[PDB]
């Protein structure tokens, strides 16, 4: 019922590990489908090959900008920006998958995986999933970011798709 997608992470080509997520389509369907669809590439565009352009250790890893690759791009499968479905789920800890935005109702394709409890984001960013496996692949990634987000090596979603 709840779809599971995976990301095969690579650090400058060198494959790191696999991180799979459970998307909560049961409570946040439109947002979960957008991520799922974008993870399979069934629409002609998606996450395969994009980089995690902003990694702030002890905060989160952010990626999903497949258009401009610098945090200023992205598009949803519904167009360039869809609304915030709801804020039923909260940033309760590490592994939480949430939508990055530019303020209310500007969801596109950018997301971020929390590597810490980030309550200050509750109500501002739509939580739609969680890390099922490979949480410490996400942790190991923190190793290539910086307090200001800049990353040393290029972290890419080498491959991604749907498992279930």
């Amino acid at each position: 019922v709840n779809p599971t997608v995976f990301f095969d992470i690579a650090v400058d080509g060198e494959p790191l590990g696999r991180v799979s997520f459970e998307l909560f389509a049961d409570k946040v369907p439109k947002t979960a489908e957008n991520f799922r669809a974008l993870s399979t590439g069934e629409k002609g565009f998606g996450y395969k090959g994009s980089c995690f352009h902003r990694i702030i250790p002890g905060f989160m890893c952010q990626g999903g900008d497949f258009t401009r690759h610098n945090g200023t791009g992205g598009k949803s499968i519904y167009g360039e920006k869809f609304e915030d479905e709801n804020f039923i789920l909260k940033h309760t800890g590490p592994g939480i998958l949430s939508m990055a935005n530019a303020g209310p109702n500007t969801n596109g394709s950018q997301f971020f995986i929390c590597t810490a409890k980030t309550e200050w984001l509750d109500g501002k960013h739509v939580v739609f999933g969680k890390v099922k496996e490979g949480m410490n692949i996400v942790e190991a990634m923190e190793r290539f970011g910086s307090r200001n987000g800049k990353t040393s090596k290029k972290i890419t979603i080498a491959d991604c798709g749907q498992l279930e």
């Binding site: 905060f59 530019a102 971020f112 960013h125």
Partner: peptide, 4 residues
């Protein structure tokens, strides 16, 4: 820039 968001999440801050």
């Amino acid at each position: 820039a968001a999440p801050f």
